[PDB]
Write a protein that binds this ligand. Structure first.
Ligand SMILES: OCc1ccn(-c2ccc(Nc3cc4nc(OC5CCNCC5)ccc4cn3)c(F)c2)n1
Length: 291
């Protein structure tokens, strides 16, 4: 069949929807990352369109193969993920110029996809892939619109809530591009501090962690919040903390940017385009990482 063209080399990992292998294309000679999803007509159309969603900071979708009750997604191969790099950099920290380069690149990736009205909806360090040159790329872009974001993965692993926007947690059915800015803000904070910003272990724990740092949202900061489906007037009313406490020793340009990425109101939250123009990026460079 179709899959006799790919030689499996090694197992990379386990995604939300299926297993990912390093593989060799026998006809072209290319080394690829092959995602195998066990199987929907609408999903096939939506995923096939992602072959056109091409940008240097988006993991290249080389092909989509629907065969034998399975969907194979053939991706470009990269060295490792940001999670491994952050774990490896725990003692010393990722240098600020490299954090800045990576955030700048990821914002370009978001600005591109958002310009075509495609959301990621499940950004997290495991979906950010790096090479030895200094590039970083977003993996799994567009798969959430095709399949949804489940509670558990295909292996029953808990899908993390740590990067989930508060509008999603409060039960908004209609997600804007702002949900990805929220997630990337949380990732930015984690790179700087070497600890997850909001490591919640349930929906309410996630919400209350957000509230304990940013203040419990009300009608002043977020018009309509008190009418949202999963909003309860019984939520405790926590005061907002200073960003100087949350992400030390990050400078005022970095804190300004982060604060705008974590605005409660999706309509007030900074866009990817606007974030690229932020003064934080005035001295941005492209360093080569220690991998
Ligand atoms: O524990 C440390 C360790 C062990 C092995 N590695 C590791 C080896 C190779 C790669 N390269 C890679 C992986 C990809 N993965 C994709 O999909 C998954 C992304 C996350 N969400 C689920 C789907 C898509 C395209 C990919 C392209 N290259 C790597 F990233 C890590 N790291």
């Amino acid at each position: 069949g179709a899959m006799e063209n790919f030689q499996k080399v090694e197992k990379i990992g386990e995604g939300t929807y299926g297993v990912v292998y390093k593989a060799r294309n026998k006809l072209t000679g290319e080394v690829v990352a092959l995602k195998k999803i066990r199987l929907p007509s609408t999903a096939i159309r939506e995923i096939s369109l992602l072959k056109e969603l091409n940008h240097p900071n988006i993991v290249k979708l080389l092909d989509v193969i629907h065969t034998e009750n399975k969907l194979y997604l053939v991706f470009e191969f990269l060295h490792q993920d940001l999670k491994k790099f952050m774990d490896a950099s725990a003692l010393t920290g990722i240098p600020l110029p490299l954090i800045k380069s990576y955030l700048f690149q990821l914002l370009q990736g978001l600005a591109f996809c958002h310009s075509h009205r495609v959301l990621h909806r499940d950004l997290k360090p495991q979906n950010l892939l790096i090479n030895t040159e200094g590039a970083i790329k977003l993996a799994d872009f567009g798969l959430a619109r095709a399949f949804g974001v489940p509670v558990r993965t295909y292996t029953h692993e808990v899908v993390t809530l740590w990067y989930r926007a508060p509008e999603i947690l409060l039960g908004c059915k209609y997600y804007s591009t702002a949900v990805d800015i929220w997630s990337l803000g949380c990732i930015f904070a984690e790179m700087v501090t070497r600890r997850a910003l909001f490591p919640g272990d349930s929906e309410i724990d996630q919400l209350f962690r957000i509230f304990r740092t940013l203040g419990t949202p009300d009608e002043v900061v977020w018009p309509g919040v008190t009418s949202m489906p999963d909003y309860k007037p019984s939520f405790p009313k926590w005061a907002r903390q200073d960003f100087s406490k949350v992400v030390p020793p990050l400078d005022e340009d970095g804190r300004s940017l982060l604060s705008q990425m974590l605005h409660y109101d999706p309509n007030k939250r900074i866009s990817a385009k606007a974030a690229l123009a932020h003064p934080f990026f005035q001295d941005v460079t492209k360093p080569v990482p220690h991998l």
